[PDB]
Write a protein that binds this ligand. Structure first.
Ligand SMILES: O=C(Nc1cccnc1)c1ccc(Cl)cc1Cl
Ligand SMILES: [Mn+2]
Ligand SMILES: [Zn+2]
Ligand SMILES: [Zn+2]
Length: 454
């Protein structure tokens, strides 16, 4: 009645030995946690990274949020940590006429869903979201020519130090060289009561991992990957405005929506309260949303394992159908790993090899097709040197790398090989096939992976 909390997501407590390697652990829990989309991880009791900061010297620019269900918000767009904390505590305290730890979590949750559904309530809140920088940096220890205490050095190279997470060797998004500040650097989040994150999935259907450093809990709702399209169909009917096409990746539209509405339409939803010192992990294509119980501080990062490689290819294909912008070229990343095959982890090498074989075979067929459309001329082209905005398919907006079609008529414009008929009105013999690699260059790159994998 009014609000029925979804069932709880899985909670794990690895031993020190299980904990030691994050990637092995995540691969272990995967068959369970991927059925629920999110899961929670409780570190061994003595794993306690030192959080230390001065609340007066950390400044950030606040974002403002209106709290209305089904209302469109844009995905991305002055306080000290002390002044924000004072505003946030006074707010919660005045809203309930109680001291902040006496407000039960069950009640804030019930109340959140009441106020977002009521339109005569126009509550607005503020929050912080930014990637680490000089005015505001990681909550985890990092190196800087500042002297560190022995406990800080202990955690400098932890797998679960979220700064290290991308650039480890069982990851695949670290090898990328056309790097993407938005996607491999950690984000910092300063919460207050009711500040919230709308329903969404990660760029390129990656994993994410979130650590609550300190403060009051963060409440999560999560949907398994297999149900992504059920949820999207429910969202199209109750709010189709969120689905009209958008001109940038900085223009994505997202919304707040009651999980009971989704459960009514047969979408499986799970929940959890994440407390200080706990991790939440989201799996590929797993929708999630939530809100903060009070003043808190969190840090999160995207990441990609070898498990994800096939999904990452299917995702880029799905972006093409939707005419959605890519953050990076998936094929470019594969070929970069192939070119460094000798220094690759061997399980990585083996899984990259399988994806490369699919890539090569799809590319063969696409080139045959455009040759039969009458495109004859061709020239090698180093796509990775072009700024991303200079190599998107005019039609579907995919980031080109393996190949593209150009014409002297439209200088600078490209189409991917799926959209040869969308470039211009000249006859095909006026077109050129631009390609990064011949098929003969590609088969030896794949062979290097086979050898490294043995
Ligand atoms: O908080 C956010 N995103 C988030 C948080 C936790 C899990 N997934 C996603 C967020 C990110 C960017 C901006 Cl401009 C605003 C918010 Cl409010
Ligand atoms: Mn997220
Ligand atoms: Zn032309
Ligand atoms: Zn295209």
């Amino acid at each position: 009645s009014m609000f029925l909390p979804p069932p709880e997501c899985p909670v794990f407590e690895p031993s020190w030995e299980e904990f030691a390697d994050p990637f092995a652990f995540i691969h272990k829990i995967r068959p369970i946690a991927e059925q629920t989309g999110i899961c929670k991880v409780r570190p061994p009791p003595d794993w306690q990274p030192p959080f230390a900061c001065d609340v007066d010297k950390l400044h950030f620019t606040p974002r403002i949020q209106r709290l209305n269900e089904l209302e469109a918000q844009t995905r991305v767009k002055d306080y000290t940590l002390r002044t924000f904390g004072e505003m946030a505590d006074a707010f919660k305290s005045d809203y309930f006429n109680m001291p902040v730890h006496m407000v039960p979590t069950e009640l804030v949750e019930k109340e959140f869903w009441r106020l977002v559904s009521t339109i005569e309530e126009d509550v607005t809140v503020e929050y912080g979201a930014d990637i680490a920088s000089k005015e505001f940096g990681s909550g985890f220890p990092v190196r800087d020519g500042i002297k560190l205490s022995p406990e800080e050095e202990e955690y400098l190279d932890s797998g679960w130090n979220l700064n290290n997470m991308p650039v480890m060797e069982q990851s695949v998004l670290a090898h990328i060289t056309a790097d993407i500040c938005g996607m491999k650097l950690p984000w910092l989040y300063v919460g207050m009561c009711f500040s919230s994150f709308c329903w969404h999935i990660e760029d390129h259907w990656s994993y994410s991992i979130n650590y609550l450093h300190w403060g009051e809990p963060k409440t999560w709702y999560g949907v398994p990957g297999y149900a992504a399209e059920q949820l999207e169909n429910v969202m199209k009917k109750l709010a189709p405005e969120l689905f009209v096409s958008q001109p940038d990746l900085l223009h994505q539209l997202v919304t707040i929506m009651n999980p009971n509405t989704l459960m009514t339409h047969e979408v499986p939803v799970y929940r959890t309260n994440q407390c200080a010192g706990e991790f939440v992990i989201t799996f590929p294509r797993a929708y999630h949303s939530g809100f903060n119980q009070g003043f808190n501080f969190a840090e999160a990062v995207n990441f990609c394992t070898v498990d994800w490689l096939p999904l990452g290819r299917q995702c880029v294909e799905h972006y093409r159908l939707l005419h959605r912008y890519c953050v990076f070229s998936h094929d470019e990343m594969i070929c970069k790993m192939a070119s460094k095959a000798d220094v690759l982890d061997v399980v990585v090498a083996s899984t990259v090899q399988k994806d490369m074989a699919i890539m090569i075979e799809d590319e063969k067929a696409l080139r045959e097709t455009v040759r039969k459309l009458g495109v004859i001329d061709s020239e090698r082209m180093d796509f990775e040197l072009l700024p991303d905005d200079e190599r998107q398919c005019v039609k579907c907006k995919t980031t080109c790398f393996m190949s593209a079609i150009s014409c002297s008529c439209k200088p600078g414009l490209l189409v991917c090989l799926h959209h040869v008929k969308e470039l211009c009105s000249c006859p095909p013999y006026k077109y050129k096939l631009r390609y990064r690699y011949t098929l003969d260059d590609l088969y030896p790159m794949m062979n290097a992976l086979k050898l490294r994998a043995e």
